[PDB]
A paper describes a structure:
[name] (SosV), from the genus Pararubulavirus, family Paramyxoviridae, is a prominent example as it has been implicated to be responsible for severe disease in an infected patient. The specific interaction between a paramyxovirus receptor-binding protein (RBP) and host-cell surface receptor during host-cell entry is a primary determinant of cellular and species tropism. As type II integral membrane proteins, paramyxoviral RBPs consist of an N-terminal cytoplasmic region, transmembrane domain, stalk region, and C-terminal six-bladed β-propeller receptor-binding domain.
Residues ranging from 158 to 582 correspond to the canonical six-bladed β-propeller of the paramyxoviral attachment glycoprotein, with each blade (β1 to β6) composed of four antiparallel β-strands. Overlay analysis reveals that SosV-RBP shares the greatest level of structural conservation with orthoavula-, orthorubula-, and respirovirus HN RBPs (1.7−2.1 Å RMSD upon superposition of equivalent Cα atoms), when compared with protein-binding morbilliviral H RBPs (3.1 Å RMSD upon overlay with measles virus RBP; MV-RBP) and henipaviral G RBPs (2.2−2.3 Å RMSD). Two molecules of SosV-RBP were observed in the asymmetric unit of the crystal and form a putative homodimer through the interaction of the first (β1) and sixth (β6) blades of the β-propeller. Additionally, the angle of association between SosV-RBP protomers (31°) is substantially less than that observed in NDV-RBP, PIV3-RBP, PIV5-RBP, and MuV-RBP (average of 57°) structures. Indeed, while the glycoprotein presents some features that are conserved with paramyxoviral RBPs with known HN functionality, including a conserved cation binding site and residues that would contribute to recognition of the glycerol moeity of sialic acid, the overall configuration of the putative active site is incompatible with known modes of sialic acid recognition. First, we observe that SosV-RBP hexapeptide residues Leu243SosV-RBP and His245SosV-RBP impede into the region where the O4 of sialic acid is positioned in other paramyxovirus RBP−sialic acid complex structures.
Residue numbers in the entry:
A (entry chain A): 157 to 337, 375 to 464, 479 to 493, 499 to 582
B (entry chain B): 156 to 343, 374 to 463, 480 to 582
Amino acid sequence: SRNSISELKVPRDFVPSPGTFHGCSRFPSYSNHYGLWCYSHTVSNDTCDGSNPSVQILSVGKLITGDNGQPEHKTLYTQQLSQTDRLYHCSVTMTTLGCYILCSKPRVNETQDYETIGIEPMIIGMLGLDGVYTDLGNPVGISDNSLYAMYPGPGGGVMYKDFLVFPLHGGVRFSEASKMLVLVLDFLYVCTLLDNIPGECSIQLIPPDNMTMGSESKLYKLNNSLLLYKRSSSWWPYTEVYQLSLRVSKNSMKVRESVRLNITSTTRPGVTGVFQAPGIIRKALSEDLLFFQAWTSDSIARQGPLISLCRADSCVLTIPLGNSDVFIGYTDSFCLSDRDNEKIYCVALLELDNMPYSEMTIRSFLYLIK
Amino acid sequence: PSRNSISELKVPRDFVPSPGTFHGCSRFPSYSNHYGLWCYSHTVSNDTCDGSNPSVQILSVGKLITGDNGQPEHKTLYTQQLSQTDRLYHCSVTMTTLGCYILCSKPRVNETQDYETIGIEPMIIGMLGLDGVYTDLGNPVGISDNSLYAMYPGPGGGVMYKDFLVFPLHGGVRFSEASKMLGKNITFEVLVLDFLYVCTLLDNIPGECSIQLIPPDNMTMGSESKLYKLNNSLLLYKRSSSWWPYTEVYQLSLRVSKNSMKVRESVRLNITSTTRPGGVFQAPGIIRKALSPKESNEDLLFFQAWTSDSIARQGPLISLCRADSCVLTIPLGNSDVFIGYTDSFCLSDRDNEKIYCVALLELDNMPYSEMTIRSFLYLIK
Ligand SMILES: *[C@@H]1O[C@H](CO)[C@@H](O)[C@H](O)[C@H]1NC(C)=O
Ligand SMILES: *[C@@H]1O[C@H](CO)[C@@H](O)[C@H](O)[C@H]1NC(C)=O
Ligand SMILES: *[C@@H]1O[C@H](CO)[C@@H](O)[C@H](O)[C@H]1NC(C)=O
Ligand SMILES: *[C@@H]1O[C@H](CO)[C@@H](O)[C@H](O)[C@H]1NC(C)=O
Ligand SMILES: *[C@@H]1O[C@H](CO)[C@@H](O)[C@H](O)[C@H]1NC(C)=O
Ligand SMILES: *[C@@H]1O[C@H](CO)[C@@H](O)[C@H](O)[C@H]1NC(C)=O
Ligand SMILES: *[C@@H]1O[C@H](CO)[C@@H](O)[C@H](O)[C@H]1NC(C)=O
Ligand SMILES: *[C@@H]1O[C@H](CO)[C@@H](O)[C@H](O)[C@H]1NC(C)=O
Ligand SMILES: *[C@@H]1O[C@H](CO)[C@@H](O)[C@H](O)[C@H]1NC(C)=O
Ligand SMILES: *[C@@H]1O[C@H](CO)[C@@H](O)[C@H](O)[C@H]1NC(C)=O
Ligand SMILES: [Ca+2]
Ligand SMILES: [Ca+2]
């Protein structure tokens, strides 16, 4: 590594625009598998808060080495899912067969859902590398009486040891949660990816011992270990990343424990939270943690959005994005490594204020760290 | 023909590229298509696109395909970024069978300072071919130093008229020199008038290029402009430079010769359906011209994304209009919804009773940057 970070022109953004004058897009969801990637977000009209029906956009493509050796996201196929009464809540996971998407289609707002036993309807689908979208129907493995609510993402899932894994968070009664082990907790949706159809799908509860209340989340796969980023939904002020240790068997993956990384380099502005998921370049494995993050700083020295390259306890590089009036909403980042060391590219997916045209829009941006 | 139905369509893939960086702005859409070939271009700077920062120019060529549901789709084949210039680019593009030709001014000073100094600011002409090669054709030949104080093309696009490559211009010429060019004394100091850049396209290289003055008798002061070719006649849309409130479109009658194209007269079409706010460049897409401008304009049909500041309609509008009235109007929002420069063009489907119109809109991008451009698609059935 070196002490250098700069922005690069992205001539062709792989993130599609809302597609109409008053359209808004929210909730970027990204997943890449080696050189293949999948991107998804939710599109509604005027406002993206659930008061209007929405659709989901799903893109798969591949990485090419464009001008100057920087990576480029080449879109191969795009699919729009059917309209839903309110918001989509989706998580995507890229595989060699294509992109799998897990979504919740709420008919009511979040508060009304958590007060009623039973989860809102869900779908799981797949966009193949041949551009064909297959609706795999209702995700199998969901018990009615046990669960009050269940939402995937918005972060992406990962492929772990031939297992299809999605991040979830939902409401489970204390009695039913203790059995598995109304509370709000963090879950994994674990499927076996035998052929083209997922099988042996179940909801695994993550041990909430060292964790905050369940929240919007993202999965990582690093050095054959699972990490979980969580939107801070509690008084805990620091970016939350948990190390997950599993116990794998044939057609069985359960979460044994969840260890919170001691991150104090970046914080949330609250003295709720915002989903601002980092791009993890180097895992901890047990001071070596290095990550890239687009976050909102409320410090006295820096008020406003920042692009940072940070260790667990400190940030080594920071790019101010503007004054406190520059709004960024949800953010998700990921970094692509160059086999030749000492060159790192990170992409920042940013929700941007789009008023008075519509609530929000998403764009991506490219940063070089040398 | 037409009926009372217009609706918007999702543009899954916008052929208009985004500024490409967080604080980037893009301004001054310029578009041109030739049969199934199209060319698009705009100006890109950092933070602000007013000349206070260096800028580059983005240039795209592509082809039209029949996308999902039978609607037209803009497939980009190649994109080119020109070298950085100290201030703004002022560019006009013209799509041909060989590719896209771009004519630009690279001013080193602001517009007021330029019109006070004899001589035009530096200019370039280049071509982006259908083979993806960008060729820098150098300084446009045919521009006289001592006569002209300023010369700016576009931002509207040019046309291919017979074998001539034609670009819209506007610039500053001294009264004596303008009367010479016109042949007659001008009838009501540096005057601001409207010009054409006319070249013969001998093979791959334009030749015998000159600046032609448009007879300003029936016209307002020169301004940002756009060329059209309809029923083998040239039309000129002009940004309003006067108290005259209506969208200005002029009919041009030419006199063609070997290596010579001169403008014989410029007739203002009597358009009263739309007006300019305040001017702002909001150029319409003209679907059907008048078979005889001096006889009537009842056949004129056009599509326009414009700002209405009337008391009855305040805010941006999408309109399908005759010369004297608009038959369909889509409100884009309240008066707080800003659109800047505008350019539209329509693609008709003869078989079906369906017309597609694309609106290129400057949109406010604060506080990220000054401006951004997006395209939007409308179906008229
Ligand atoms: C979308 O929202 C805009 C205002 O943001 C409104 O004018 C328009 O009618 C809406 N369209 C639909 C289909 O609801
Ligand atoms: C959710 O919907 C219920 C239904 O009436 C309403 O009472 C409640 O205020 C809503 N909550 C939010 C946060 O909008
Ligand atoms: C984290 O949680 C696991 C089980 O939930 C527990 O074994 C461990 O002691 C906790 N603290 C750590 C790993 O630092
Ligand atoms: C977490 O890191 C901070 C950084 O200085 C340190 O002060 C604190 O003791 C650490 N916590 C633990 C449990 O080691
Ligand atoms: C672009 O503008 C931003 C603020 O608007 C400024 O911080 C940055 O240095 C500028 N970049 C260049 C290359 O001028
Ligand atoms: C334009 O440039 C001149 C020359 O420096 C300067 O005096 C003037 O203030 C600038 N702005 C104008 C003329 O609006
Ligand atoms: C044309 O105008 C100039 C200056 O106003 C004048 O000196 C000249 O005599 C005029 N010529 C004719 C033919 O009107
Ligand atoms: C002005 O318009 C009239 C008819 O409207 C036309 O006869 C005349 O030639 C025009 N003048 C010029 C200089 O084009
Ligand atoms: C050409 O003129 C004819 C008759 O005046 C008219 O029907 C037709 O629409 C015109 N074509 C265009 C492209 O305006
Ligand atoms: C233009 O046409 C309108 C009728 O649509 C008429 O009222 C107006 O006087 C005309 N203007 C001119 C200059 O002939
Ligand atoms: Ca419920
Ligand atoms: Ca000058």
